[PDB]
Amino acid sequence: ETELLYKVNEYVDARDTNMGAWFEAQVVRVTREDVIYHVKYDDYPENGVVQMNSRDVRARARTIIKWQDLEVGQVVMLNYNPDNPKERGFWYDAEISRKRETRTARELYANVVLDDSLNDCRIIFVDEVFKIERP
Known about the structure:
It is classed as ligase. The protein has strands spanning 11-15, 22-31, 36-41, 49-53, 57-59, 75-80, 90-101, 106-113, 117-123, 130-131.
């Protein structure tokens, strides 16, 4: 039932559909864009092999968008913590909503995708925002 966009053994990012965050994973098998990916998590072997929808897997993030180049309306991958926004959390997709700079302060607001989205979030890790790799 093998199908041969991301090839078997290629490293990817996989979206935990339960919480909406992206995690480093690897493609173990590809089955039959309406393709179903078989994936293992790099840091979570207790997860076993998980079947993934083709939209829930993409090329691993590699490019940081610097604070200067961040613009309102971009969809990016960034670090946020829904339960306590002041702390480090997980890599969610987000729409840059508001961007403000002061002499001493850099302020970033984003609509975080959790599907349901979480509007007007104060993003702490403003220097660690990723470009989402498109095919």
